[PDB]
Ligand binder design. Sequence first.
Ligand SMILES: *[C@@H]1O[C@H](CO)[C@@H](O[C@@H]2O[C@H](CO)[C@@H](O[C@@H]3O[C@H](CO[C@H]4O[C@H](CO)[C@@H](O)[C@H](O)[C@@H]4O)[C@@H](O)[C@H](O[C@H]4O[C@H](CO)[C@@H](O)[C@H](O)[C@@H]4O)[C@@H]3O)[C@H](O)[C@H]2NC(C)=O)[C@H](O)[C@H]1NC(C)=O
Ligand SMILES: *[C@@H]1O[C@H](CO)[C@@H](O[C@@H]2O[C@H](CO)[C@@H](O[C@@H]3O[C@H](CO)[C@@H](O)[C@H](O)[C@@H]3O)[C@H](O)[C@H]2NC(C)=O)[C@H](O)[C@H]1NC(C)=O
Ligand SMILES: *[C@@H]1O[C@H](CO)[C@@H](O[C@@H]2O[C@H](CO)[C@@H](O)[C@H](O)[C@H]2NC(C)=O)[C@H](O)[C@H]1NC(C)=O
Ligand SMILES: *[C@@H]1O[C@H](CO)[C@@H](O[C@@H]2O[C@H](CO)[C@@H](O)[C@H](O)[C@H]2NC(C)=O)[C@H](O)[C@H]1NC(C)=O
Ligand SMILES: *[C@@H]1O[C@H](CO)[C@@H](O)[C@H](O)[C@H]1NC(C)=O
Ligand SMILES: *[C@@H]1O[C@H](CO)[C@@H](O)[C@H](O)[C@H]1NC(C)=O
Ligand SMILES: *[C@@H]1O[C@H](CO)[C@@H](O)[C@H](O)[C@H]1NC(C)=O
Lengths: 193, 596
Amino acid sequence: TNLCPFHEVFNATTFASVYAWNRKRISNCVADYSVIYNFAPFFAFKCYGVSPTKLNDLCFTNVYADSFVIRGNEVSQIAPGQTGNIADYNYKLPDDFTGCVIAWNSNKLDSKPSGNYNYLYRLLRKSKLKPFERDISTEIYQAGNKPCNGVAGPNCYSPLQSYGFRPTYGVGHQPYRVVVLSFELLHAPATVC
Amino acid sequence: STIEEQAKTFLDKFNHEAEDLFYQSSLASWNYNTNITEENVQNMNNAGDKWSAFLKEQSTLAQMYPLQEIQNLTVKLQLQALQQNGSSVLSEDKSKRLNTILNTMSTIYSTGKVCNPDNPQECLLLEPGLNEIMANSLDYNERLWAWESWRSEVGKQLRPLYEEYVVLKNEMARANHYEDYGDYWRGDYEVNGVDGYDYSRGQLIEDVEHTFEEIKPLYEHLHAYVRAKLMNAYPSYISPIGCLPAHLLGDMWGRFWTNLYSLTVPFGQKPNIDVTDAMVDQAWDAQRIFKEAEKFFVSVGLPNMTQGFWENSMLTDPGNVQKAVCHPTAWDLGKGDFRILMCTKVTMDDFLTAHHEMGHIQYDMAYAAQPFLLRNGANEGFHEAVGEIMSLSAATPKHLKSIGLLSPDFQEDNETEINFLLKQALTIVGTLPFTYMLEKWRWMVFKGEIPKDQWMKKWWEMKREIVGVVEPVPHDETYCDPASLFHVSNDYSFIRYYTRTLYQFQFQEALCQAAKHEGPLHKCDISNSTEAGQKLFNMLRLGKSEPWTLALENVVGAKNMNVRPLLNYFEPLFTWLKDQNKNSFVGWSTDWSPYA
Ligand SMILES: *[C@@H]1O[C@H](CO)[C@@H](O[C@@H]2O[C@H](CO)[C@@H](O[C@@H]3O[C@H](CO[C@H]4O[C@H](CO)[C@@H](O)[C@H](O)[C@@H]4O)[C@@H](O)[C@H](O[C@H]4O[C@H](CO)[C@@H](O)[C@H](O)[C@@H]4O)[C@@H]3O)[C@H](O)[C@H]2NC(C)=O)[C@H](O)[C@H]1NC(C)=O
Ligand SMILES: *[C@@H]1O[C@H](CO)[C@@H](O[C@@H]2O[C@H](CO)[C@@H](O[C@@H]3O[C@H](CO)[C@@H](O)[C@H](O)[C@@H]3O)[C@H](O)[C@H]2NC(C)=O)[C@H](O)[C@H]1NC(C)=O
Ligand SMILES: *[C@@H]1O[C@H](CO)[C@@H](O[C@@H]2O[C@H](CO)[C@@H](O)[C@H](O)[C@H]2NC(C)=O)[C@H](O)[C@H]1NC(C)=O
Ligand SMILES: *[C@@H]1O[C@H](CO)[C@@H](O[C@@H]2O[C@H](CO)[C@@H](O)[C@H](O)[C@H]2NC(C)=O)[C@H](O)[C@H]1NC(C)=O
Ligand SMILES: *[C@@H]1O[C@H](CO)[C@@H](O)[C@H](O)[C@H]1NC(C)=O
Ligand SMILES: *[C@@H]1O[C@H](CO)[C@@H](O)[C@H](O)[C@H]1NC(C)=O
Ligand SMILES: *[C@@H]1O[C@H](CO)[C@@H](O)[C@H](O)[C@H]1NC(C)=O
């Protein structure tokens, strides 16, 4: 009777941006995995490796949960092997990955008629990210063969860009809230189980 | 690190920067259009000003990136379109003066007073009974007075304004490096840099004249029939052989001949197909009409509507509480938002308009995948032909009977076929010579072949010759007859309507050939075919990605427009009219002058 804090991450007021996706590690608790069914019909529920039918019977060493808000069609890019803007720059998954990915529509609390502007993403960078790394540094993007000062002006672009959300947006542009569950057996000699 | 990479990055930022502003502006415009208040009009004004300022700033910023250095073809189209709708040329007190001139022209066209015959008293307007009496009046003198009165009140003041407008417009066209402003409009149908598929500005004029001279026989014969019927109806007012006098064609301007119906019907004994009675008998509704339209558009093999559309649409007049401008439009707010502003009144006509507007909406959904600068459909006639083909295929007695509104015991006869074909022709073929004349005259006026002093006389001579209608009353340089058209007063191209008929009939022939159906194509449907749907959707995906010539090839299998589909459509009417006109003599003689 020492339950894991899944309810805390799922039901929260804010979820933060994509390029600064939060990380949380939890251990030494009673796993329940019953809170997941206390939500609306999930837009996508795909599990890689483990199977929800069995679920809690397994053992593991460490588990990680990451949460962030994306837009509509961008859900598909969250996959083991795929290509796209968000997967190449904003947030990357390794090919040899196992776990489960969960995302549900949330165009009722993250969208305002005046236009929500508290969510951003990166669309201009080089050096496609190695899996599981976060780049939060913002600097003026160099384009061409001219020295570039702090001011962008022409031929220099400031990266990052806001989504903008309104209740009348069509499906595929409505905000989505995604949480990805990542855990490993730690095949190397592990003290705990 | 390369120029094309720089252009790609610039366009990538531009699209995401511009979609939000465009959405805001279009939403404000929709709110004003459905709700006309001072706050709404101010919001739309400031939103449009911000959008225009952003567009001009971006276009000025796009000064670099030379096209001959650009290699990727698709990049060139976006860059050219941006440069074209962003170029601001000429000086202050000239551009601003031209804008004020346009505003004054719009205001004076909107405010038009005819007053009373030889009596200063209350004055009418075109939206009120001014054009209604022309539509439904049988009094020759009453039509005489109003037709000249409208031009007398409006046009005399527009003549110098129109002269200065033409001068300044040619001044800008010179700076745009185009040959002239007629060439500026003619540049829309242009494709270069592609082998096999290419189109210059010169070929358009010769194609138009070739198509018109191919069409002329049928129009001549229809004119002979109409003159004979009008002589039968109106006594001692029309010469048996000669030009057909105005005031009688219907409408304020004579563009459409549909109001001329009910006087020249060949067989009035047979009841009309019009089925507006069954709607009120079964207690139809606007929801039911639009659901039937959706059912047809999903039976052809295309996706259904969206819940956002169904919940944010605007289909029935709220009432006197809130005032709205009842006029069918198919808005595209962007970001996956689509809705209609219309006022259904439970009629067969409204049913046809619903099937007409849903076609535009489906096209808008179709090209949504392409980039922002390439969203708008290739050519300016395709997006109307796609709307009209659904209307053509949705009014057949076979389709009506299949739906169930038509009486199951109704039978088709050649008399009814002739009636239907004549009613369709009165609008389909009547407008072609008028559009051709108007566009040709405006082209010559812009280019400068015709000197100023001969504008009115040459215009009226051309109207006497090409369309066989003579002026009733003398006109001099004081009058400006063509200025009464809304399109010419508000700076809109006019050859799109001429291309629309050819495009729609070619599309219909190709589709009805794809879906195996024998017999005349004048009664054809594509309700239950899943191949014509794919044939259409393949071209609907592209947008401006490919040249319109390639799109036409992909659709029909030809390279350029032809009047053979239209002639094949109207063969039975041609034969019946030839049979009827044994005694009468076709043609006209401009030498006869009831004007004198
Ligand atoms: C680059 O620059 C060019 C040139 O400026 C732009 O081209 C414009 O494209 C738009 C989109 O079609 C044109 O808008 C059209 O205007 C027509 C004129 O109608 C007038 O009159 C009616 C009353 O009769 C008014 O209600 C109306 O507001 C206008 O004042 C309309 O008839 C057209 O509507 C047609 O399509 C709609 C689709 O929903 C149907 O519902 C309608 O029934 C109808 O079939 C249309 O709205 C505009 O005229 C073009 N400009 C010029 C100067 O002609 C490009 O868009 C631009 N590129 C960009 C911005 O990316
Ligand atoms: C001119 O520039 C445009 C814009 O880049 C080029 O179109 C691009 O073509 C590539 C294919 O070479 C497309 O890549 C595709 O990406 C999707 C992403 O999921 C992937 O699934 C596909 O397998 C493919 O790799 C790219 O999307 C496309 N860009 C756009 C905006 O449509 C075009 O090819 C260039 N011209 C020439 C002649 O190459
Ligand atoms: C039409 O426009 C008027 C003017 O804005 C709207 O009236 C306002 O409605 C909002 C609600 O959205 C109120 O907060 C304002 O106080 C109202 N102002 C006035 C002066 O009444 C009206 O609601 C609009 N009609 C619609 C949207 O159907
Ligand atoms: C297209 O297919 C639909 C459904 O197969 C047809 O609709 C049926 O028409 C028959 C003919 O009288 C009726 O008995 C059925 O009740 C109709 N079913 C439905 C669901 O409406 C339609 O007639 C077909 N149209 C064409 C032109 O073939
Ligand atoms: C989320 O948590 C708060 C406080 O724990 C609770 O009041 C709220 O009801 C929860 N959300 C749902 C959907 O139950
Ligand atoms: C569209 O929606 C209607 C209404 O629910 C449904 O009957 C039809 O099957 C749908 N078609 C498609 C292609 O989604
Ligand atoms: C129309 O059909 C009737 C019989 O179906 C026939 O007597 C008549 O000659 C036909 N008229 C024309 C113009 O085809």
